[PDB]
Design a protein around this ligand. Structure first.
Ligand SMILES: [Ca+2]
Ligand SMILES: [Ca+2]
Lengths: 151, 64
């Protein structure tokens, strides 16, 4: 039994990808947006991803190619197993996110394990997603990802 | 009296407050602060940041 609140139709899709490698590898985990135009573009957002720092080292977090003027509009940081993301079109109208694709790329260096291990990279701690008018996007589908480390 | 948008509590609302609120939002453990919740939704997040920037740019007359 489900109700309408449980089943969105239109939603912005925000998806953490997956990666695999062996200890010592550096892999890239993308954060991808879909249905951007449907949802009337993205003008601002902030959110947080959790990861296991005993298994992964954050090497870098960079904006993806859908983000215009990222040096001004995009910020990221990582502390104590949480990666923070913030985007705002600082022109408000002229540098919106208007295309589907990669919003950010996380580079993780893989640490040692004694057996093949899959570790999740997960949404936590709330946030905000605003459309091209900076208004709340009514539905956002957030999908977690992972890294598999195979010794 | 509350000065909406006054991140650094200096009585003014200017670019310094915008820079501060950006960094504050990125702290996952940032606390609720009444003067930063300009849209009255009981959260401090990107929506508040966007309204502050619109105000600094002269696109809105009021922080609301
Ligand atoms: Ca101030
Ligand atoms: Ca608010």
């Amino acid at each position: 039994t489900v109700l309408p609140k449980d089943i969105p139709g239109d939603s912005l899709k925000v998806t953490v990808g997956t990666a695999n490698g062996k200890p010592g590898d550096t892999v890239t985990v993308p954060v991808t947006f879909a249905d951007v135009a449907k949802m009337k573009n993205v003008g601002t957002c902030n959110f947080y991803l959790g990861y296991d720092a005993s298994l992964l080292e954050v090497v870098s977090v960079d904006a993806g190619p859908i983000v215009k003027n990222a040096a001004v509009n995009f910020s990221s940081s990582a502390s104590n197993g949480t990666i923070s993301f913030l985007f705002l079109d600082n022109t408000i109208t002229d540098e919106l996110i208007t295309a589907d694709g990669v919003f950010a790329n996380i580079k993780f260096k893989l640490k040692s394990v004694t057996a093949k291990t899959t570790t999740p990279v997960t949404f936590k701690d709330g946030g905000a997603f605003g459309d091209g008018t900076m208004s709340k996007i009514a539905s956002v589908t957030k999908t977690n990802g992972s890294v598999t480390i195979d010794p | 009296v509350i000065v909406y948008g006054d991140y650094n509590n200096d009585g003014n609302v200017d670019s310094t407050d915008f820079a501060g609120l950006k960094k504050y939002i990125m702290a996952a453990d940032h606390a609720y602060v009444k003067n930063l919740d300009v849209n009255l939704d009981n959260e401090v997040n990107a929506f508040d940041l966007a309204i502050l920037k619109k105000y600094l740019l002269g696109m809105v007359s009021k922080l609301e």
